[PDB]
Amino acid sequence: SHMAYISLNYHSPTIGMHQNLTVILPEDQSFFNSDTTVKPLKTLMLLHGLSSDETTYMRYTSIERYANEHKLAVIMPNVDHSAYANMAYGHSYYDYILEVYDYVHQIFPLSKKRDDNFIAGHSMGGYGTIKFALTQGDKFAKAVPLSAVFEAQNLMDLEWNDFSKEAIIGNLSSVKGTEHDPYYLLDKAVAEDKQIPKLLIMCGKQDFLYQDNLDFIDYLSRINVPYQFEDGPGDHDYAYWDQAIKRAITWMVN
């Protein structure tokens, strides 16, 4: 089992500026044989939080080692703070992550089947994960929010830069009951009979978001949305996300 480690710098049409991506691509024998078709890989979209970039999971966890064991391609895009609340509709975080998805599935040998595509992330990346699970449920078979932001008030506790923080403060009164509120997205997804990915939700018991995580899964239980929840000792850091992403990858592929 071998992996190709890829760094990609490209101009993003959605954001309108350059963005970096990390891609780890398992080596498959079909990729070296010019006479056979490529065998498409299972693929995880992995979303970092506000103190990270496209290199942090590589540096602060052993994710590549876990992915190599399970022959899992992983896509780690850079996410700028301004993507979440400073951009116009159509040019925001949501659109950008879907652009990354489309681009890497066009240019790399990644499966396009729902059963072969997963999404995961922590903190604001866990907010991203649950938003994509509830709006792009036909795209991802499984979703793993880690130490996730589920509530509007959580947003004021985070490490936003100055320009993004000003947009967060200025639009806070507009989050609840909109497409930016995970609870609203959840209620809507059920109503439109949308596919919801299988959910594995994880949080450490010392995390400042732990109780809001319990509140979210309690609501899931009350509206009969299936999920698995795993907790244990751990805080809001990569010592926990290293352990959690190892467990998540095993769960995803099996």
Place this chain on the structure above:
Amino acid sequence: GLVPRGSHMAYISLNYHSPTIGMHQNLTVILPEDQSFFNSDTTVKPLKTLMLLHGLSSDETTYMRYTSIERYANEHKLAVIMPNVDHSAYANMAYGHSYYDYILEVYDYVHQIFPLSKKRDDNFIAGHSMGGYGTIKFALTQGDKFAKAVPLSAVFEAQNLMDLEWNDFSKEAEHDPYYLLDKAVAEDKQIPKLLIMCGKQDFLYQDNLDFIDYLSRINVPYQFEDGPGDHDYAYWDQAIKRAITWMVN
């Protein structure tokens, strides 16, 4: 889903384990951002592709740093593949007789995993110094794979291999362009269109004049472009600009 306006390149660094040499190797790939790559509802448009071979004083980043090749390739919507063929890697490939195998492996791998045209008319090869020697060898033994070949300031023997502080054991431890040329002409093999370049102050200028004289006598067509320049990236920057324009037109 939004698609690029105008011409942009993706800059890609790839590290992969090579089945051929059983070692990890770096590649640089510059890949045009074609609109089809951002539209999930269309088939990808395969791109014209250059395999570019650096010399023994370089690595897979040197062309990026010491020329403006990416700017030239962006203008002409050309994908460029720059494998590491550095001095230690080449020494291992030459000893194990795996150099052809490695470059062919790189070719096959990038055409499998990236949206690169597999048609001969869309595939080119180029390189300078020992990479020009390599370009000539691939032109004469793999003429069916490349429509065009551009040797820059080529050497015609692998003596530069010895220009490292090898120990005596390593020093002591069909690769002739002219033999390969005779063979290709005798057997009526396909030879790519040839653009041969060398600067007039290069120590290798006379060796290149000797080679094109032999191509004339043996009736192999070519274009030869020369001018002021020495054996350096000031020359290769200008030469690869010209080569890329020639390749894609």
